[PDB]
């Protein structure tokens, strides 16, 4: 049987910053959702409209895996409705979600003794995101009346700030790798069935 790739979106070698999340489109499978729900590795496996045990018997025509890395205390903002600095500016989920949000601790892979300065997040934006609208715009944000003219002196801060991921931060600032599955129903034959 031609199982899905869940060994290159879950146990990868390096994930992506939350401001530019990684979107992988899964199709044409016989997926195995019960391997995930019974792995005892994930600390958060919340399905938001699908019965997690009834997952293994139901076709869908596309799945989307949205991989990124956040703080442990910021995983709360990957639910429909919650807001913060992640759900507002970095990754917004709609309040009709039909999927499962998965996460686990990753302090062994995404931490350096001096700190991992490679996992950025968007700290400043004009207005909130709308569902699944990533924004790779590394241009200067203006929070003051004076026009900015593209120089980062004062009230012209760089919008992306880097997580400081040391191995001694707390169980709530250590890096948690989030993989969000979102299912689709296009009026076309079903591929991902399992």
């Amino acid at each position, epitope marked *: 049987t031609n199982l899905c790739p869940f060994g290159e979106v879950f146990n990868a070698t390096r994930f992506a910053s939350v401001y530019a999340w990684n979107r992988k489109r899964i199709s044409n499978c016989v997926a195995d959702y019960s391997v995930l729900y019974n792995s005892a590795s994930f600390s958060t496996f919340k399905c938001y409209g699908v019965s997690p045990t009834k997952l293994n018997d139901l076709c869908f025509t596309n799945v989307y895996a949205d991989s990124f890395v956040i*703080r*442990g*205390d910021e995983v709360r903002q990957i639910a429909p409705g919650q807001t913060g600095k992640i759900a507002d500016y970095n990754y917004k989920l709609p309040d009709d979600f039909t999927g499962c949000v998965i996460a686990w601790n990753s302090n062994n892979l995404d931490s350096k003794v001096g700190g991992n300065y490679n996992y950025l997040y968007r700290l400043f934006r004009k207005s909130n995101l709308k569902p699944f609208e990533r924004d790779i715009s590394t241009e200067i944000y203006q929070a003051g009346s004076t026009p900015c003219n593209g120089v980062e002196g004062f009230n012209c801060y760089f919008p992306l700030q880097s997580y400081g991921f040391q191995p001694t931060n*707390g*169980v709530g*600032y250590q890096p948690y790798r989030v993989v969000v599955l979102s299912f689709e129903l296009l009026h076309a034959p079903a591929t991902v069935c399992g």
Partner: antibody
Amino acid sequence: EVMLVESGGGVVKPGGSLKLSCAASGFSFSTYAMSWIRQTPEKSLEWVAAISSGGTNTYYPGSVKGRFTISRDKAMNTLYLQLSSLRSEDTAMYYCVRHSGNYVDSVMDYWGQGTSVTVSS
Amino acid sequence: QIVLTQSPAIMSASLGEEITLTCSVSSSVSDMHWYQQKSGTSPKVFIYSTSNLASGVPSRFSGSGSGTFYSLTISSVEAEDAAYYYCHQWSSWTFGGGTKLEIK
């Protein structure tokens, strides 16, 4: 109802070992994340080790990482903390703490009685 | 990393009056839990998720906050509310300072 009592705290030598046991009773032991918390004579509480519901996750702070090992025994319904290489800064009381959820995420519902560790002579 | 500071380290309120406790965080955290400990007793939880009174605490306490500022306010301080009040959250490794309250 739910109750936790510890045992094993006493007098040890610097650089020695010890094993603090926590015998929980009153609830299904294998669906709550648990932790140990030490309180120094300065009355300052300090998270020192935490284990998840199953047992596949243990989180230690930067001070004690490499000297304290937390452990769980679901059959006998106990929770162990094995100390090692005890400096003189570990003189403190040790509380067995039961989180409410199945992870170290949630609040610390019930705090055990505690046992004293004194590291000298 | 996160440091949790509580000010001041001692407060004195006369009976029946209203007191207020503060917990300031070095950075942003979602929630915050408040535990109580009297002298000679292992601590007890009072508030979880910044505003939920535990099952057993009197209904006179209260609390709220967000970001880097949380507060626990006692409406009618009595003789029994004389203890240490520690603020701690998931992301610290160390409890707060603890404002030893004693009735005036």
